[PDB]
Amino acid sequence: TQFDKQYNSIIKDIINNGISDEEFDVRTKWDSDGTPAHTLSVISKQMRFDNSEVPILTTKKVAWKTAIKELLWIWQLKSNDVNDLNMMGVHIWDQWKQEDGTIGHAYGFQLGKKNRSLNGEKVDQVDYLLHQLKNNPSSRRHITMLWNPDELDAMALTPCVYETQWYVKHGKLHLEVRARSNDMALGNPFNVFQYNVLQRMIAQVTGYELGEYIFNIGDCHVYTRHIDNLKIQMEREQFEAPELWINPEVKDFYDFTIDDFKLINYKHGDKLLFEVAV
Amino acid sequence: TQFDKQYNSIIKDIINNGISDEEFDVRTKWDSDGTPAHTLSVISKQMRFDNSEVPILTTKKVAWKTAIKELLWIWQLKSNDVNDLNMMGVHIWDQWKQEDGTIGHAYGFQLGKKNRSLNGEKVDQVDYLLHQLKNNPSSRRHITMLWNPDELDAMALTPCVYETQWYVKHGKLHLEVRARSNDMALGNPFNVFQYNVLQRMIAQVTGYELGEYIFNIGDCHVYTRHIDNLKIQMEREQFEAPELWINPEVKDFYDFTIDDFKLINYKHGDKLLFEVAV
């Protein structure tokens, strides 16, 4: 179920069926003329994968490394402090760094919260999701939630991929994910494969085969300047997906390191520059 | 976009492609033999409507009244006390009534919380969603959230239809909804049409045409005993959807009463008994 087939199956749709944000006074803008940059969009689109292969673009390179790195920060480290993410070599967050170093009450800070009761002892979303999966697989409640109505005003930025719903059906683990928004041009390919990594990880530790991987986008859009450039990507060549490796010797979620993930034989397209926009 | 066409388009799929919960020790059971009742299910299904008609079953009657009544309780009254819902004639909640009368920190209690900052003055989810829609339509954040990770342990029951995402595109208001679970046999038809009512209501008060209505289900299932009975419903006749009425003289969300809603010329099927199950 190549990520490519579905990816371009959604792009043209947006160029052809998308609605321009025009009618409004957007705040975001390019960087070569300050001229407010404008987009086209569609509501509610969905990408599903049977897991016979890694969902990753092959008509362009993805930040597969920076992607898994940011994953450990949010779900493994459950940290909101940017320094931790700077320690991994990633800086793409430096922009929302608060005078104290963190991004406020969002992302990792939501998962680390010891808010659930588990055998006369409080625990956090990630720890709760873990135990229940192997002691309450049938449960129709396996849900992580980033969108906290209580601390929304306290986060330095509103999350995109904010929730997930897992299912344990027939020795299989299914992962559904949802984004309230998503840039198909610079945000989607990175997020997708990234949250699919997280799936393979818990899958291995809980000892359950991988089920379907489903990714849900609410507002899907692309910027205008990015269109002419996406059309080429569509016609670009399509190679076979790589073979992501993950040390099988690991048996604990918090044992994984950026050194246990290796994408093998990853053929992808060439450099494609997509104009910057504040 | 009759609700019927899509409804049965999902039922057979479940009978044919659904997976039995069997493998597990379910807690829920029938009531004629205590024998644990069992189901079949599918993950991630979706129902969309263009709003040319009311999404309501015509091969069976829906609690269209009890449905809108429960809607005012959660979103209008933002109450968690069962007495209020008993005052409307509804008792279908009496089961989860706590020693104090309420269902804990769930449903209405989540929407009434004055947790957002609006012009140097705190306000609740419902009040926030309202103002922003007419002063920040373009916003990609219009979201209500019932799933509170902080008070989950405090609710007397985990919510099904827990969130919503609205969009204001071209004088149109689009409403996306999601359920973590949903019984296609006794829960779905009621929920769907119900959250579509809520849409028509804010639509009228904000003064925006209705956009697409999208309903998302995570775990969709039906109980075994209910199968033989759903097959008949499928072959039942299909009449044209009714013409829901709503007093146009209203201009405030909190002015609506169960007396402003009238389904006109509603042709539906006959009585279909679906075995009870604790």
The DSSP result for A158-197, as a single string, is: --SEEEEEEEE-SSEEEEEEEEEEEETTTTHHHHHHHHHH
Choose the catalytic residue: B67, B72, B160, B202.
B160
Distance from CA of A115 to the nearest CA of B (A): 6
Chain B residues touching A180 at Cβ < 8 A: 140-141, 143, 165
What is the spatial distance between Cα B132 and Cα B14, in angstroms, rounded to a whole number? 39
As for how many domains chain B has, the answer is 1
User: Which residue among A46, A150, A211 sits closest to B150, beta carbon to beta carbon?
Assistant: A150
Phi, psi of A241 (to 5 degrees): -55, 150
Distance from CA of B253 to the nearest CA of A (A): 21
DSSP 8-state class, residue A246: E
The Cα-based distances of A90 to A67, A85, A110, A172, A275 in angstroms read 10, 6, 21, 33, 21
Residue A44: other Cβ atoms inside 10 A: 18
- Look up the domain containing A152 and give its range: 1-278
DSSP 8-state class, residue B31: S
Task: List helix spans (H) across chain B.
Answer: 3-17, 64-71, 82-87, 108-111, 125-135, 188-206, 227-235
CB spacing of A169 vs B48 below 8 angstroms: no
Residues 12-41 of B with CB under 8 A from A: 19, 21, 23-26, 41
| CA angle, B49 then B225 then B278, to 5° | 90
What is the spatial distance between Cα A223 and Cα A38, in angstroms, rounded to a whole number? 6
CB spacing of A44 vs B44 below 8 angstroms: no
Cβ-based neighbours of A248, under 8 Å, separated by 6 or more? A204
What is the spatial distance between Cα A236 and Cα A124, in angstroms, rounded to a whole number? 44
Chain A residues touching B217 at Cβ < 8 A: none
> At which residue do the structure tokens 């009496």 appear?
B94
Backbone interruptions in chain B following residues (C to N > 2.5 Å) = none
- Are A81 and A99 spatial neighbours (Cβ–Cβ below 8 Å)? no
User: Which residue among B148, B167, B218 sits closest to A150, beta carbon to beta carbon?
Assistant: B148
Choose the catalytic residue: A37, A54, A103, A160.
A160
Distance from CA of A89 to the nearest CA of B (A): 30
Mutate to test the interface with A, among B111, B169, B215, B217 (most CBs of A within 10 A): B169
Structural tokens at position A259: 């050194």
Nearest CA among B8, B75, B56 for reference residue B193:
B56
Distance from CA of B103 to the nearest CA of A (A): 18
- Are A101 and A230 spatial neighbours (Cβ–Cβ below 8 Å)? no
Structural tokens at position A45: 């689109």
What is the spatial distance between Cα B79 and Cα B108, in angstroms, rounded to a whole number? 5
- Are B212 and A43 spatial neighbours (Cβ–Cβ below 8 Å)? yes
Q: What CATH code is carried by the domain that includes residue A23?
A: 3.30.572.10
- Tell me whether residue B160 is one of the annotated catalytic residues: yes
Resolution in A: 2.2
What 3-state class would DSSP assign to A267? coil
What is the spatial distance between Cα A100 and Cα A176, in angstroms, rounded to a whole number? 34
What is the spatial distance between Cα B115 and Cα B145, in angstroms, rounded to a whole number? 12
The dihedral formed by the CA atoms of A179, A184, A189 and A195, expressed in degrees to the nearest 10: 0
The Cα-based distances of B25 to A128, A168, A238, B20 in angstroms read 20, 14, 46, 12
Chain B residues touching A148 at Cβ < 8 A: 145, 148-150
Is B121 in the A-facing interface, judged by CB distances under 8 Å?
no
Cα Rg of chain B (Å, integer)? 19
Chain A residues touching B218 at Cβ < 8 A: 140, 165, 176
Residue B122: other Cβ atoms inside 10 A: 13
Chain A residues touching B178 at Cβ < 8 A: 178
What 3-state class would DSSP assign to B216? strand
What is the spatial distance between Cα A200 and Cα A204, in angstroms, rounded to a whole number? 6
Q: In terms of DSSP bridges, do strands A116-117 and A122-123 run parallel, antiparallel, or are they unpaired? A: antiparallel
